[PDB]
Write a protein that binds this ligand. Sequence first.
Ligand SMILES: Cc1ncsc1COc1ccc2c(c1)N(C(=O)N[C@@]1(CO)CCCNC1)CCO2
Ligand SMILES: Cc1ncsc1COc1ccc2c(c1)N(C(=O)N[C@@]1(CO)CCCNC1)CCO2
Lengths: 37, 619, 165
Amino acid sequence: DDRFNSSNDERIRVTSERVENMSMRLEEVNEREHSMK
Amino acid sequence: DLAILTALLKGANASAPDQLSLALAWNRVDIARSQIFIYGQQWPVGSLEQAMLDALVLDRVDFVKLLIENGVSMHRFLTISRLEELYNTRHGPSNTLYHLVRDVISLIDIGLVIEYLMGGAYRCNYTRKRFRTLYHNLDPEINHFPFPFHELMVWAVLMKRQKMALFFWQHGEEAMAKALVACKLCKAMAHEASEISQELNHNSRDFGQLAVELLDQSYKQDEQLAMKLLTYELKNWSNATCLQLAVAAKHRDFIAHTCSQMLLTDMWMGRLRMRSGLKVILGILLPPSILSLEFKNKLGRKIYEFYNAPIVKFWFYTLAYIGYLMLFNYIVLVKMERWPSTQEWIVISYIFTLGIEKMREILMLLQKVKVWLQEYWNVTDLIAILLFSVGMILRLQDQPFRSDGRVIYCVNIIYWYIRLLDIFGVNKYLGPYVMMIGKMMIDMMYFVIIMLVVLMSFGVARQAILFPNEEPSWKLAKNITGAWIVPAIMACYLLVANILLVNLLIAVFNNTFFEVKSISNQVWKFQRYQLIMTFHERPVLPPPLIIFSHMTMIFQLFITDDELKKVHDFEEQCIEEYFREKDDRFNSSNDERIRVTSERVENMSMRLEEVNEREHSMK
Amino acid sequence: LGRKIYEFYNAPIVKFWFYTLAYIGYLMLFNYIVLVKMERWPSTQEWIVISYIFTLGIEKMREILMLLQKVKVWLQEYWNVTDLIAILLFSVGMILRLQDQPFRSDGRVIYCVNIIYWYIRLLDIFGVNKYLGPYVMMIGKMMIDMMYFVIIMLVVLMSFGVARQ
Ligand SMILES: Cc1ncsc1COc1ccc2c(c1)N(C(=O)N[C@@]1(CO)CCCNC1)CCO2
Ligand SMILES: Cc1ncsc1COc1ccc2c(c1)N(C(=O)N[C@@]1(CO)CCCNC1)CCO2
């Protein structure tokens, strides 16, 4: 398991969906900030 | 969350040297780096020294790194007594020291162990007369080593603490001497423990790879100073030069580097600049014509230098052999009168002189004879002179014996011819090929065994059917009813002689070339050094005239201090550059640029959701 | 001591070097009972060479004992089969040795033809060495291809020979 989860082939695939999740949360934070403004 | 858990125990009291001792005990260097070594900490005298001692005895890398980074100077720390305490500890992981002590604890005994491990005429600094009389007790600077990193390097290698060895190598002066001495000691302890071994072979391969790289950088930066580093005589490591320590550790890669081959070629040409064969043979064959060539610069003497160029000795020491193989042939294909003719007295004599030089080389006892008999050509030479000798004293009898005399000479001429090979070895193309012929022979012997088995079987069957009544006879030994089986089982023999194994031999001498071609290219570039250091030692005169030089015996790069400091700086720039360049080549690769940005991504995501809940509360 | 030795005899490397010196003896005497005259009855070295084949037979069967399943497992590999043929033909020759001349000359025949196999077994003993064994196995594998190209060369050779003759 330690030889598996240190390889590049998982370190890319998890961080891709982490990136898209943070982008959608960022735009929801954007519309909340404009409503509070 | 273990750091504040340990900080609870660090906050339990205030004895800061005991706190540093406890931090060394739990073996967590980040805690001492964060909390202990801060501004305004009080320190008594002797606490840092005892802390350094307790850190060195227990295999602590980062603690010794941080204590050296915080005031501890090794030029004021280490004395002879505390180093003796380091060699007499009891906390070692795994050591083979006491076995070497019982095979050869006082430091003079340690120096005897080191001299036994390296071998040769290596005279270590512990066994000098300047260190031995100072050891009688057990200025203020009489127990301090001026170059203490060499002793720390030796203590790191001998007790097998590898990460400490790699740490101690990269500081101080004279890194390549320490690297080659480490490679020699690792290979010696590996062979001695075989006589752990895989670990020591790996460590020898490690220092060995590292030393070669520093040369690669030191050649990649400059050349004229680069040559100086290899040549200078160390005044510390037993009067050796780095190239001799490279060959004496049998490291085939260091000599294989281009700078070593260029230095050997500049040794080979000697005192000339003509960059050869027709000119150097015309120089011998026309002795007044030598003046037209171009010398170096730092008559009546312009010549004596020419005779000492080892390429000259070579072309005037192979013209003497060409003479010997032409006269010896003419003393065999011709009539032999009752006493020996002139060319026989000359051919007998050349073997005579060759014998006295060959023994004199050994003189310059059983260890010397074993080192001389380590390789094969001296052995074959010893047999050859001996049988051109039995034949020599059998020459001087009557006919029954004389005819026998022809025998030995007849059989003895094969070896001198088959030596020519060696002379042909020098050329930059025939030498690798000759080495290959040597390696292929083993396989020739094994398939000779298999072909002998099958040949003897079919021969015994064929000869046993076709001769039924043959009483026991020595005649049978000299050779050693339904005949129609004899043709068929003859033909199948050819079907398993000239079809199956010959084509097996061709298959096994075709898929073995791709490794032996890579091996021989290394072995030739290594063994040029033995040739070049061989002929400085053989006189100028030919072997049928060497009696003058032998009876005259029977009759009865040094550098200064400022260029030395330049050398120590040239090395310093290179060592730091290698580490920096290694780090810049590491941190630019993809395999770190992905792994750091993954955890950067997850950290920003968690901070983003905390910012999200804060923004909704503020809304 | 007094027993320090009996262990030595049970080390299997010992059995090996005292079970291949017995074979070296067998292939030297059998050669000397073929390249020499044969008197009307068998000589001493023939009684010893006949006997070694005799004992080898009883151990080989005893190994099988220790029924058709056992014989099939024993005949799973080839060297027992080749061994079974060899003892059998050094046998037909054994009972054809004991007749008159017309037959005696025939007797020489079988022994003459039978000596090839014992020599070609040596190979196996050579198999133990850590270099000759892989090579012997290779010789065994290459043979198939030898047989196929023997077939092709036989076709072409027979054609040109029939035309020329
Ligand atoms: C030299 C010498 N000694 C006695 S008679 C005589 C002259 O015969 C020649 C002529 C040309 C040569 C050599 C010998 N070679 C040679 O001597 N190689 C060494 C060095 O002695 C190194 C290791 C292999 N053997 C010894 C190699 C080929 O070039
Ligand atoms: C042993 C033995 N039996 C009857 S006469 C006799 C002594 O002859 C030798 C001498 C040296 C040997 C062998 C036999 N070998 C051998 O027996 N191999 C085995 C085991 O029996 C395994 C599979 C291949 N064949 C059988 C192989 C090579 O070493």
